[PDB]
Amino acid sequence: NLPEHWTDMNHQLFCMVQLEPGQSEYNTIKDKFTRTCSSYAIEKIERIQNAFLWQSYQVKKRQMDIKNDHKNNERLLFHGTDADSVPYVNQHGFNRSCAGKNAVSYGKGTYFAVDASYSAKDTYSKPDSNGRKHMYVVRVLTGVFTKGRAGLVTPPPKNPHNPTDLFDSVTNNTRSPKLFVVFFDNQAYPEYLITFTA
Amino acid sequence: NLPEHWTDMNHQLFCMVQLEPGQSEYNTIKDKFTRTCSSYAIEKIERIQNAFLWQSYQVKKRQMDIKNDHKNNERLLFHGTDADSVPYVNQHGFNRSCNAVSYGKGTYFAVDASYSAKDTYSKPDSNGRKHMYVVRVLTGVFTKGRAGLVTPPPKNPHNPTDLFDSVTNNTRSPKLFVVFFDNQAYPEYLITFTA
Numbered sequence A: 001n002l003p004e005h006w007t008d009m010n011h012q013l014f015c016m017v018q019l020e021p022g023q024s025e026y027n028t029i030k031d032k033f034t035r036t037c038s039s040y041a042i043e044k045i046e047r048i049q050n051a052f053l054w055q056s057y058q059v060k061k062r063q064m065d066i067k068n069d070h071k072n073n074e075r076l077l078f079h080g081t082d083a084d085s086v087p088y089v090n091q092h093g094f095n096r097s098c099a100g101k102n103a104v105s106y107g108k109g110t111y112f113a114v115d116a117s118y119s120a121k122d123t124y125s126k127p128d129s130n131g132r133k134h135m136y137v138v139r140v141l142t143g144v145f146t147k148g149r150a151g152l153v154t155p156p157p158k159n160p161h162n163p164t165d166l167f168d169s170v171t172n173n174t175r176s177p178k179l180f181v182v183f184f185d186n187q188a189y190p191e192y193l194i195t196f197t198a
Numbered sequence B: 001n002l003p004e005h006w007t008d009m010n011h012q013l014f015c016m017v018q019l020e021p022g023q024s025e026y027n028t029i030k031d032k033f034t035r036t037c038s039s040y041a042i043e044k045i046e047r048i049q050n051a052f053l054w055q056s057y058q059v060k061k062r063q064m065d066i067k068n069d070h071k072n073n074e075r076l077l078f079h080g081t082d083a084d085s086v087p088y089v090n091q092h093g094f095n096r097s098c099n100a101v102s103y104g105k106g107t108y109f110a111v112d113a114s115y116s117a118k119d120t121y122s123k124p125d126s127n128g129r130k131h132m133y134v135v136r137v138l139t140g141v142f143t144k145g146r147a148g149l150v151t152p153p154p155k156n157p158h159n160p161t162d163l164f165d166s167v168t169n170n171t172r173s174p175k176l177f178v179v180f181f182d183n184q185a186y187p188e189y190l191i192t193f194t195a
């Protein structure tokens, strides 16, 4: 069930794997980051191998793939974090109950950015005592989405006369999405941790 | 991998199945309720057949069975719901983001049906009908809760990310459990009843 490219974790359930510059895997993430964060410098990129988070995420993805009509349900997005949160996210993923209020709120959930520049703001990727900033690269089940609203604690219904049939996520703008908000556990898999500095 | 006791769903993924009174399954669930709620009249008991919620719950159960290195992680508990919330719970299960919550900001489950039978939880609808779930809950290894928790405490603060599975009001004689994650609770039956 675990991806074949992962390092052997010899019965362990969790490993952070340091990537090598020059490998396609490192270079693709560096390029995705530098597209909007060219003024910052990457210290390192770690692949997050969390068996339990992966299993629960892949179950949710299979369900969304069944429910939705041949939709690309998954986007690769960014999430800036403070150093104090990194151990919890690595082990347990993204908990909406711990999320800050966003400067522009489209609901009470976990926020993910299309552009690394957004997540690179000190408000999200707070510099630690050594000047290191931390950003996850995250597989997010955006599914079918609509423009969010500050009051939401779950995604809104697609149809007001069927209140239980929900959008998968919300966004700031359906025409030009720059952020997505998810409201359920195991809808986002933290795949890489970028450590970076000015 | 849907349970044998489920009945065929004609290739659908969600069904509420009304149980036949006086058959073994109805009798078992009725007895669990009447242990503390024998003064309440049961209108019906429905089996909740939600393939997606069951899948996600069974994955969490398998994980908790590995993590705890032992397999007594599940309890059968009660939860009272207002009528307006029953369709959401049937389809999406319990949501901590949706009464006093003095043991933490999670989903609450009662050991005794009598606790969930309070009108503050199982709010009577226009017709006096009250609604209570019988819930499979992954209580796992638990500790005493306290106000304002957003996750269970660590089992050892040397390792702040290795958490208890749930919290309770009283570890020696628990009457309520709180879980803080989606898919730690599977709503298995819905009881419709009157005072």
Ligand SMILES: COc1cccc2sc3nncn3c12
Residues within 6 Å of the ligand: B078, B079, B080, B081, B099, B100, B101, B108, B109, B110, B115, B116, B117, B121, B176
């Ligand atoms: C203390 O118990 C609850 C606190 C908050 C909500 C509920 S819904 C329910 N059903 N049985 C008990 N509860 C509770």
